[PDB]
Design a binder for this molecule. Structure first.
Ligand SMILES: Nc1nc2c(ncn2[C@@H]2O[C@H](COP(=O)(O)OP(=O)(O)OP(=O)(O)O)[C@@H](O)[C@H]2O)c(=O)[nH]1
Lengths: 49, 148, 360, 50, 43, 49, 49, 21
């Protein structure tokens, strides 16, 4: 059924979101970030104020 | 979306299996505005140390991996943990990432200077309507689980 | 999926109607058979203007340009500048904004640049004294059109600023079942880059037609000269019949071409204003489209408007049919109990539209 | 019970309808004194909600 | 059966922390008087 | 009351998984419902139709 | 009597008369999807933030 | 090898700066 297809899609999305939630945050979301911790020249690419 | 002033209530668990004993009503609130986009921002702090000090002037390291990063952040407002304010004056050619800074008062080697900055954040486009009536049991609907 | 329409007819109305409803629409077969098929330049610019004053809207125009897909977003307004192509005057672009401006998240502050008058589109004075007064009856308390510079065709160069401070949840429910007793006749005669003698001659011509009447005739003389007078010579007149009783206004307008006699245009416009009063019951034919649209988007209530049989023409029917296609609302007409005249009561049930864009 | 408290809170936020409290199983009480006291406590708590 | 807990039952909400002596006025006054005698011994 | 109007022939030819046509009887409340078809409504726990 | 097309089959099959079926009309803004800004507080009786 | 990677990083930064510009 179409409902079953939608349910499968939500299962895929929930798996992906669970993996994101357990996964360690990106470098920009540690609060204090050091030059060594982040990738080299990351700030140039990113937009910060 | 909805008209503003529309009240709503929130619940973290709807299935009977996870009801437990605590109260299930999690949040209450009023919709204030409806839009297509939002500009949530998060605080991001860059951390380094001084290694060479001349009264107000000092040289700092570990903020930036290359002088290129320094170039983007000249004139940036910085301060110590002690609260002494300052400025990113100029990137030193050698070594990469080292830069000169001036401060209102002399800093101690043990102190740590920090640059305050703001990082944009995005809202996750996740939509999972509750469809209990479509299920056989009609009382064990389960969606995205809590982080815990 | 999409409500479909054919041809370029009522483009501005259909797009505006879609924006208010929030219902996506498709317009197809736009000038398919013409040598230059598809979308015209000015009517492109209107789509740009619609995009500027809203957020989240998606507008697609086909590769051949004969088909358009519009998925409306929310009305947000803001401060912006629009450059109007010479093919159409500012009144072409201002007029649709009168529908949309009062229902925005933020105040409309749009600066229009281009020709300010034409033979076929609403003039500045038509908008200032002829159209917004209808909105003010519907609850738009604060609205103004500031004429910073006049631009006559073909070089134009005029500049007008539209400001609509009033933001309202929805139009009030109208109840007008009488013939407004129009008390005085006012108007503005204007000219650019020419001698004042023309403007005076026009007021003479209008006065000759209107001298036999039993009310005031006071026509303003607004002679524009110098830097702010635009780049081309031009001159026109707008005469407004005012009902101070319920603040209803009836207006006719026209502009002059090179070599035309100023007295004749004054005679014609005064004569045309006289036509409109005879053909009207509560609102003029040139004002009826705004009134009907506003009533459709009112509270879930019926507003009553008296309309003369002469107003029920080709344009009125196609307007109503477009309204039903988008909003499914049906305009009902009933005879008036009187026998002296033949007017009809237009009863329109509102849809309960509300301003959700505005923050609270 | 939770379902009673949970339901009232939902009603309060989503627009209060008329609420009428109906007490049952009062015959299970064995003393008239404790029955009256129990009625008093439930009524006052119910008065706080509605 | 999911019986109501103490917070739901008493519905005390948020209140400031109050010393136990406030529960009985007699004890509070006793302590105050003794403290007054001790302070008098200094005066 | 609840009733399914789907033709039994369609149920067997395509299978039970086919979407259905359903009729709902009841009393209307609140603001009047427009007579013309095509109105958007939401059925709790089912979706928008 | 209101007739709906394309209803999920599970609604017809897994139909319990005990559970109410509530149909609610939708205004134009209810149809649109987007970011919603709200003032929210944790419920006073909820244990955890 | 390392110099090539540095060159690639420089190209990526230049492209991003152009995209801002
Ligand atoms: N002694 C006593 N028994 C009661 C009282 N009210 C209900 N009961 C009993 O409680 C049982 C349940 O009664 P119901 O009418 O089925 O209540 P219900 O809400 O339908 O219960 P469920 O639908 O099964 O969840 C019955 O056996 C009743 O005799 C009361 O005041 N006193």
């Amino acid at each position: 059924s179409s409902f079953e297809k939608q349910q499968i899609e939500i299962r895929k999305q929930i798996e992906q979101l669970e993996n994101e939630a357990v996964a360690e945050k990106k470098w920009s979301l540690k609060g204090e970030v050091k030059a060594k911790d982040r990738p080299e020249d990351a700030l140039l690419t990113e937009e910060l104020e | 979306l909805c008209s503003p002033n529309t009240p709503f209530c929130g619940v973290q668990i709807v299935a009977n299996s996870d009801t437990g004993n605590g109260f299930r009503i999690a949040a209450t609130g009023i919709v204030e505005e409806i839009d297509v986009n939002i500009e949530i921002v998060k605080k991001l702090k860059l951390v380094g140390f001084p290694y060479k000090i001349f009264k107000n002037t000092a040289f700092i390291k570990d903020m930036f991996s290359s002088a290129m990063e320094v170039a983007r952040f000249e004139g940036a407002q910085i301060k110590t943990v002690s609260g002494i304010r300052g400025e990113i004056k100029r990137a030193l050619s050698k070594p990469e990432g080292h830069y000169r800074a001036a401060f209102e008062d002399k800093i101690l080697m043990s102190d740590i200077v920090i640059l305050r900055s703001w990082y944009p954040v995005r809202v996750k486009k996740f939509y999972n309507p509750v469809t209990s009536l479509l299920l056989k049991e009609k009382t064990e609907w389960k969606g995205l689980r809590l982080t815990g | 999926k999409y409500t479909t329409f054919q041809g370029s007819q009522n483009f501005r109305l259909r797009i505006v109607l879609a924006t208010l409803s929030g219902k996506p629409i498709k317009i197809e077969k736009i000038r398919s058979g013409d040598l230059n098929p598809g979308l015209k330049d000015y009517e492109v610019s209107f789509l740009r203007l619609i995009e500027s004053v809203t957020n989240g809207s998606v507008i697609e125009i086909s590769y051949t340009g004969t088909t358009v897909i519009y998925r409306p977003g929310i009305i947000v307004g803001g401060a912006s500048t629009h450059i109007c192509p010479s093919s159409k005057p500012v009144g072409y672009f201002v007029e649709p904004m009168l529908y949309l401006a009062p229902f925005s998240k933020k105040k409309f502050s749009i600066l229009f640049k281009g020709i300010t008058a034409s033979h076929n589109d609403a003039g500045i004075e038509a908008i200032k004294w002829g159209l917004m007064p209808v909105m003010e009856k519907f609850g738009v308390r604060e609205c103004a059109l500031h004429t910073l510079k006049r631009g006559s065709p073909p070089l134009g160069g005029g500049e007008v600023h539209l400001v609509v401070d009033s933001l309202i949840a929805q139009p009030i429910t109208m109840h007008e079942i009488d013939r407004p007793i129009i008390s005085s006749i006012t108007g503005v005669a204007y000219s650019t880059r020419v001698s004042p003698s023309l403007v005076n001659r026009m007021i003479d011509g209008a006065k000759k037609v209107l001298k036999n009447l039993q009310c005031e005739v006071n026509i303003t003389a607004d002679v524009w000269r110098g830097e702010n007078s635009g780049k081309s010579p031009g001159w026109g007149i707008t005469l407004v019949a005012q009902s101070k009783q319920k603040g209803w206004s009836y207006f006719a307008e026209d502009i002059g071409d090179a070599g035309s006699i100023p007295e004749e245009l004054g005679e014609k416009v005064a004569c045309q204003l006289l036509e409109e009063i005879s053909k009207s019951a509560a609102v003029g034919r040139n004002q009826l489209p705004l009134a009907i649209v506003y009533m459709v988007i009112g509270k879930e209530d019926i507003g009553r408007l008296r309309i003369n049989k002469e107003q029920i023409d080709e344009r009125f029917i196609i307007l109503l049919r477009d309204i039903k296609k988008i909003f499914n609302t049906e305009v009902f007409l009933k005879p008036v109990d009187e026998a002296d005249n033949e007017d009809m009561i237009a009863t329109i049930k509102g849809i309960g539209f509300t301003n959700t864009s505005k923050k609270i | 019970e939770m379902e009673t408290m949970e339901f009232l809170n939902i009603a309060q936020h989503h627009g209060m309808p008329r609420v009428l409290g109906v007490a049952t199983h009062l015959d299970l009480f064995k003393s008239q004194s404790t029955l009256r006291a129990s009625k008093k406590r439930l009524k006052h708590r119910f008065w706080t909600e509605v | 059966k999911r019986a109501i807990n103490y917070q739901i039952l008493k519905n005390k909400g948020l209140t400031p922390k109050r010393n136990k002596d406030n529960r009985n006025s007699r004890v509070k006054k006793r302590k105050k008087y003794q403290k007054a005698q001790k302070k008098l011994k200094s005066v | 009351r609840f009733t399914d109007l789907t033709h039994p022939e369609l149920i067997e030819t395509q299978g039970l998984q086919i979407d259905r046509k359903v009729a709902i009887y009841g009393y209307l409340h609140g603001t009047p419902l427009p007579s013309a078809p095509g109105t958007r409504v939401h059925i709790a726990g089912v979706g928008d139709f | 009597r209101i007739v709906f097309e394309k209803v999920p089959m599970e609604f017809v099959k897994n139909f319990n008369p005990k559970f109410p079926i509530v149909m609610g009309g939708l205004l134009p803004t209810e149809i649109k999807f987007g970011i919603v800004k709200a003032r929210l507080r944790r419920h006073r009786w909820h244990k955890k933030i | 090898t390392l110099a090539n990677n540095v060159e690639s990083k420089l190209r990526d930064d230049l492209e991003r700066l152009k995209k801002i510009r």
